[PDB]
Amino acid sequence: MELVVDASAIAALYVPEERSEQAERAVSQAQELHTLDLAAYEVANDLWKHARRGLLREDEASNMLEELWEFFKALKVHSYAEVLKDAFALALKHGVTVYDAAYVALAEKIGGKLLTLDRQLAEKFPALVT
Amino acid sequence: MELVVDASAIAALYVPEERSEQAERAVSQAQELHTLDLAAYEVANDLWKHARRGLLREDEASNMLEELWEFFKALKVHSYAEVLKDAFALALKHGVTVYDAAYVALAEKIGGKLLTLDRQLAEKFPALVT
């Protein structure tokens, strides 16, 4: 099983975090983890929000961003060129953002599934989500 | 002059659109245009919004996304790996999003300037923006 992990899924893995048994089994059993270039910015941005809200010290958030960087080396990172056209058509059809549609496009492309903690996304693509 | 164009700047160029004399002179005089992988998703997402709001027919929005794709071949497209660490530190320091900070990080990296139609962004980096 090829497994796409979006930004919410990476956030739960790259540092110690609580995860459903379901999430863990998917990651555990995957042949390989895949994501998009996009996820790097999305995870980093969520880290920025946490810092500015006073939940992380600035040096602590900077250290975590190093860890994210190191985590990304264990991922197969795909580019926008591979999915952009499919992502847009999926966004138009299903009424989800191109950002979200992109991960679904990628799961389809690699013949795999998507792990997302986004329940709303997960409901729109039952055949593609774990 | 190396010129970074963000998503708002690409939107004004990849199809016939009104532009300030200032924007035109910057693009005209640039040695080369540069952007991020990120901009592809951001422009496509803005196109999706326009379609869903009833401003573009679905086939018309799909044709424009083809044009965007063809436009991107004239751009030097840089990846998240080149800017992510700088983008985060700039986001923390200046109180802007990692998404925005990324283009500024890229202008700095290539020794060039940034063309953005985002006045708020443009005010935070006067030395880096056209």
Ligand SMILES: [Ca+2]
């Ligand atoms: Ca396709």
Ligand SMILES: [Ca+2]
């Ligand atoms: Ca640097």
Ligand SMILES: [Cl-]
């Ligand atoms: Cl916030």
Ligand SMILES: [Cl-]
């Ligand atoms: Cl909208």
Ligand SMILES: [Mn+2]
């Ligand atoms: Mn979401």
Ligand SMILES: [Mn+2]
């Ligand atoms: Mn903006």
